[PDB]
Amino acid sequence: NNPAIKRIGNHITKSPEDKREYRGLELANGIKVLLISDPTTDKSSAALDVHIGSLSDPPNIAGLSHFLEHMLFLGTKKYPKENEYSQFLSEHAGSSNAFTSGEHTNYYFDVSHEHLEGALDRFAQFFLSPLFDESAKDREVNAVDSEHEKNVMNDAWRLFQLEKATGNPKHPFSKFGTGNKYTLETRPNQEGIDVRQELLKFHSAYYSSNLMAVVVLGRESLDDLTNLVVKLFSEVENKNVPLPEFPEHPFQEEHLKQLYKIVPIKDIRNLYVTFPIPDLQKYYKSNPGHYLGHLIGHEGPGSLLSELKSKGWVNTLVGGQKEGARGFMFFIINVDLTEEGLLHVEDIILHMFQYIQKLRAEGPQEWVFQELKDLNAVAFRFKDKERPRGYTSKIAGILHYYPLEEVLTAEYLLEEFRPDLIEMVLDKLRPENVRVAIVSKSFEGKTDRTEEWYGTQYKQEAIPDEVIKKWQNADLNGKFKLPTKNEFIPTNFEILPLEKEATPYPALIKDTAMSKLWFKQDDKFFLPKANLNFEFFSPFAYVDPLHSNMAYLYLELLKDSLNEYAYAAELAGLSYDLQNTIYGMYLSVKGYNDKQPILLKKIIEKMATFEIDEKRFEIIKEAYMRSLNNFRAEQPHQHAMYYLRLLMTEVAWTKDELKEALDDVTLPRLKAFIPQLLSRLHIEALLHGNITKQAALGIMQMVEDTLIEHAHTKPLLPSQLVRYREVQLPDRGWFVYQQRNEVHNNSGIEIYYQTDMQSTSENMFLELFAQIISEPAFNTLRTKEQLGYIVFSGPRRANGIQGLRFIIQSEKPPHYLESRVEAFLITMEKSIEDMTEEAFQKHIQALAIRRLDKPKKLSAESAKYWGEIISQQYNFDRDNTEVAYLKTLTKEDIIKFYKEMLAVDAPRRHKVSVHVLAREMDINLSQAPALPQPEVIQNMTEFKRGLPLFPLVKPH
Numbered sequence: 001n002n003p004a005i006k007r008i009g010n011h012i013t014k015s016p017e018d019k020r021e022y023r024g025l026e027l028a029n030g031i032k033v034l035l036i037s038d039p040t041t042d043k044s045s046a047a048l049d050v051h052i053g054s055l056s057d058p059p060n061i062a063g064l065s066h067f068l069e070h071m072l073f074l075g076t077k078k079y080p081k082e083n084e085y086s087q088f089l090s091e092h093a094g095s096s097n098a099f100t101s102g103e104h105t106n107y108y109f110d111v112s113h114e115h116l117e118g119a120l121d122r123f124a125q126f127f128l129s130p131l132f133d134e135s136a137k138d139r140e141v142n143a144v145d146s147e148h149e150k151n152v153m154n155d156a157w158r159l160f161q162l163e164k165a166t167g168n169p170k171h172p173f174s175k176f177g178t179g180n181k182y183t184l185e186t187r188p189n190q191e192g193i194d195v196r197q198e199l200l201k202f203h204s205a206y207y208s209s210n211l212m213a214v215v216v217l218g219r220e221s222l223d224d225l226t227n228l229v230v231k232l233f234s235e236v237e238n239k240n241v242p243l244p245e246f247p248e249h250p251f252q253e254e255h256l257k258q259l260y261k262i263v264p265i266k267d268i269r270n271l272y273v274t275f276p277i278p279d280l281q282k283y284y285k286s287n288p289g290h291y292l293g294h295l296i297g298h299e300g301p302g303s304l305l306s307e308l309k310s311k312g313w314v315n316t317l318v319g320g321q322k323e324g325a326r327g328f329m330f331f332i333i334n335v336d337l338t339e340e341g342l343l344h345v346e347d348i349i350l351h352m353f354q355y356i357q358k359l360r361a362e363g364p365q366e367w368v369f370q371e372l373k374d375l376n377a378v379a380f381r382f383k384d385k386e387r388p389r390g391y392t393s394k395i396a397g398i399l400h401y402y403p404l405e406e407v408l409t410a411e412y413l414l415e416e417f418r419p420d421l422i423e424m425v426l427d428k429l430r431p432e433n434v435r436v437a438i439v440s441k442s443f444e445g446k447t448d449r450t451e452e453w454y455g456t457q458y459k460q461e462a463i464p465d466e467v468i469k470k471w472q473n474a475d476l477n478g479k480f481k482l483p484t485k486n487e488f489i490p491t492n493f494e495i496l497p498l499e500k501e502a503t504p505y506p507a508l509i510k511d512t513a514m515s516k517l518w519f520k521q522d523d524k525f526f527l528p529k530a531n532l533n534f535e536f537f538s539p540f541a542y543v544d545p546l547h548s549n550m551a552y553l554y555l556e557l558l559k560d561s562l563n564e565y566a567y568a569a570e571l572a573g574l575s576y577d578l579q580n581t582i583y584g585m586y587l588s589v590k591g592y593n594d595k596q597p598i599l600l601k602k603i604i605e606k607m608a609t610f611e612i613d614e615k616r617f618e619i620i621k622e623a624y625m626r627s628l629n630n631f632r633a634e635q636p637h638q639h640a641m642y643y644l645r646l647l648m649t650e651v652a653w654t655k656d657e658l659k660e661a662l663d664d665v666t667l668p669r670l671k672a673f674i675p676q677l678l679s680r681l682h683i684e685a686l687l688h689g690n691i692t693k694q695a696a697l698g699i700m701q702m703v704e705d706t707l708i709e710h711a712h713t714k715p716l717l718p719s720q721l722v723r724y725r726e727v728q729l730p731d732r733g734w735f736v737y738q739q740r741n742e743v744h745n746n747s748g749i750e751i752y753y754q755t756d757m758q759s760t761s762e763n764m765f766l767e768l769f770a771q772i773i774s775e776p777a778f779n780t781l782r783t784k785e786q787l788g789y790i791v792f793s794g795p796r797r798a799n800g801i802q803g804l805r806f807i808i809q810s811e812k813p814p815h816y817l818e819s820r821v822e823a824f825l826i827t828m829e830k831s832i833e834d835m836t837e838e839a840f841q842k843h844i845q846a847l848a849i850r851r852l853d854k855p856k857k858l859s860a861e862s863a864k865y866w867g868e869i870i871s872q873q874y875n876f877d878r879d880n881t882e883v884a885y886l887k888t889l890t891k892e893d894i895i896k897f898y899k900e901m902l903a904v905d906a907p908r909r910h911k912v913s914v915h916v917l918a919r920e921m922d923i924n925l926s927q928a929p930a931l932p933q934p935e936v937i938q939n940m941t942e943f944k945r946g947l948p949l950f951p952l953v954k955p956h
């Protein structure tokens with residue numbers, strides 16, 4: 001009945017709360033495809049995944065398949081304009097991206113729902129006749145090198161590659177994924193390689209249709225999506241490439257029983273423990289890896305972490321199966337170490353083996369599997385609806401692993417109980433497979449080897465057999481017990497009926513001196529979850545730097561205490577967030593509403609009758625010290641972003657202020673602080689989800705009552721509710737702050753043009769300008785000028801004030817990035833004058849679609865409202881108000897605004913810049929305007945003292 005379509009799959013099993021409609025099918029050419037029909041989606045999306053990635057790079061050009069990924073975007077035969085694709089999305093409310101794993105390259109985009117076809121068509125071309133333009137290839141190789149450069153100094157990446165580089169060197173596993181300027185131009189030049197050819201070769205070899213999965217999601221009928229996909233994608237070449245496999249492990253027991261001593265960049269202290277295991281993927285229906293993962297990783301009473309944490313040796317632990325490739329995986333157990341811990345490593349690893357030994361002696365436990373099976377089934381049934389980009393991307397990957405029908409459920413549902421497999425994998429977690437890496441500053445000087453790509457310093461040893469034998473004889477250890485029934489598993493999921501007096505936006509259903517309660521019963525998502533947000537205002541949480549440190553430490557200590565208890569709930573999909581703000585504290589409780597008042601009570605109770613364990617205090621303080629220090633190792637752009645926040649906020653305590661005031665925090669002094677901070681508060685809360693007005697009031701009152709009883713809390717005076725103001729920069733003024741980043745050899749810059757207060761009109765002016773320049777900023781500063789990998793434009797908003805910001809991390813100097821951005825601003829004024837009246841309306845419509853996307857999941861609606869509430873703006877209808885107004889703006893309005901606030905010689909141009917310089921300093925392109933001469937900020941206080949502050953914004 002149809003020659004283009006091999007199979008039509010069946011009734012892809014979905015959660016019965018999922019209203020979206022699905023069809024899977026194999027094409028003639030072998031492409032696996034899922035089609036998602038959602039007649040209500042605001043954005044359509046699609047994704048393609050090719051089962052080939054950087055493991056299939058040729059040896060002589062590292063990171064080629066990653067680089068090829070970068071180039072599919074920059075031009076194809078049918079749509080040859082360098083940024084046809086980029087621009088097409090921008091103009092139609094879309095966004096796009098790609099990643100490359102060892103074994104996949106994965107491409108996704110989303111677009112306004114009615115331009116799915118336009119978007120999708122420009123997209124199919126990536127896989128049919130791309131161009132790899134000679135001029136692009138040349139330019140874009142720099143993007144890759146920046147991306148690598150960004151990664152060079154960050155520990156996560158260094159360890160990641162140092163693993164690869166200590167396995168069998170002949171194994172594809174050992175390769176360098178990212179690539180750089182050296183590997184992809186400098187060197188293929190030296191060895192006479194035409195790269196455009198080499199890209200064409202690879203794309204031709206491997207981007208074969210039998211290695212591809214597609215997901216398309218749109219408002220269209222399933223039958224409509226079907227036709228569309230067949231049209232755009234039947235034309236893909238089947239080169240019948242055999243799928244690569246790696247049946248032989250890269251860790252070969254020439255490589256087992258090794259210890260590695262590693263020098264970190266940040267001052268961190270972890271121990272990595274790895275075991276090579278076979279590929280468990282096929283066992284997905286029983287999932288032994290998860291089971292042993294669930295147990296070893298456990299954090300409850302009688303768990304492994306519990307003991308290590310109790311001898312003060314470790315703080316956090318992570319265990320479980322680790323993805324490798326077709327043919328191999330790892331099983332890992334990783335901990336961070338205390339100072340004491342770093343000296344009892346041998347011991348810690350022994351404790352790990354005692355726990356494994358316990359699991360062997362107890363045997364595999366069906367009741368535990370039954371629990372995992374039940375949590376997973378509940379998780380699946382009541383899973384939140386996904387944003388379409390993530391969703392298509394995600395399924396496109398897993399289409400390569402599961403029958404069409406199982407794609408939605410395969411990652412969730414458990415079916416087979418498999419003692420044998422559990423017992424089999426358990427047999428591999430033995431000292432004679434073990435690999436140990438310790439990462440610590442204490443190995444500086446003491447290392448003797450260097451990893452070539454990132455420059456990592458390490459020493460390598462055999463583990464002395466004394467020590468292996470010593471681990472092999474792991475006794476049972478009475479302090480280790482399996483978890484007991486998880487009491488927190490939800491049993492009640494009944495959706496309460498929508499009330500007689502329910503409203504579309506959160507209602508102010510309580511306004512005492514103690515508390516302001518915002519509430520809305522869920523009229524949208526119908527899952528048995530709720531979101532409970534509380535802002536606790538106390539002025540002592542930021543009164544000074546020392547107090548700030550205590551507010552923090554207090555909160556960490558508390559979290560640390562409850563960890564054992566709450567982890568049970570985390571697994572039952574009930575979780576909490578608790579950190580300190582400049583305003584006081586913040587507390588979220590998210591998840592299956594069923595046992596939710598219970599966790600809340602246990603938190604507030606613990607919070608208000610807290611007892612501090614000295615040894616916990618000691619450790620967490622040392623951790624926080626390192627933590628503050630380690631800011632000096634963060635990326636140049638975060639540095640620049642931070643300094644700006646420091647420059648434009650009425651009050652803010654610097655990292656050095658905090659760390660110097662931190663040696664001053666004794667155990668007795670914190671013990672005073674807590675009862676003190678809790679003594680007067682005000683509380684604003686949003687309660688949102690499957691709960692009733694009375695359930696809500698009860699919860700709010702219950703919180704208050706617990707503080708009143710146990711901490712004697714009373715109300716703050718309304719006038720103590722200081723919110724903080726933004727600094728107000730003069731007309732035609734330009735200030736520069738300058739610092740150096742000591743770790744990173746990129747530099748960074750933020751430029752901020754301050755405009756005015758937030759207001760329906762000023763808001764849209766900035767937003768619309770932001771939109772029109774969004775994609776050209778990126779296309780000019782990265783694609784053409786290749787100034788860096790990190791290139792960001794868009795609105796900035798703080799303390800009620802707003803403006804335009806640019807962020808760039810780059811090889812070239814800040815004063816230079818300044819000129820190219822200011823140059824760019826003129827290019828924009830020109831092309832706004834030049835751009836068609838319909839071209840202009842696209843951007844309006846585009847920003848409108850963007851602004852109007854309905855939240856898909858409950859906690860995404862919550863976020864929007866909490867936005868309004870913590871900002872004291874309380875404009876729950878902003879999206880409608882503000883769109884209405886946007887639709888009535890003209891080319892003329894936006895030019896005035898630009899010539900008013902933004903242009904180089906603007907009447908009211910307020911401009912500050914942060915230049916963060918790299919470790920080491922002190923044409924084809926358009927006309928940069930000559931700039932004023934800046935006022936170089938030398939002192940953050942002398943700076944803020946001498947300028948007006950802005951008014952805080954008006955409510956309602």
Ligand SMILES: COC(=O)[C@H](Cc1cnc[nH]1)NC(=O)CN(CC(=O)O)Cc1ccccc1
Binds near residue numbers: 297317318322332
């Ligand atoms: C939830 O059940 C688990 O399997 C454990 C639990 C755990 C919680 N805290 C420490 N362990 N989680 C994990 O093992 C995390 N995994 C898998 C994952 O994140 O999907 C291991 C992992 C994570 C990152 C990088 C390599 C392995």
Ligand SMILES: COC(=O)[C@H](Cc1cnc[nH]1)NC(=O)CN(CC(=O)O)Cc1ccccc1
Binds near residue numbers: 096097099
């Ligand atoms: C600084 O700019 C970016 O964030 C870019 C790409 C982008 C394209 N259009 C808007 N932004 N990078 C990423 O998002 C990073 N990806 C990798 C890549 O694009 O090469 C990281 C990543 C890693 C694992 C899973 C998903 C994404």
Ligand SMILES: [Zn+2]
Binds near residue numbers: 066070144147
């Ligand atoms: Zn990349």
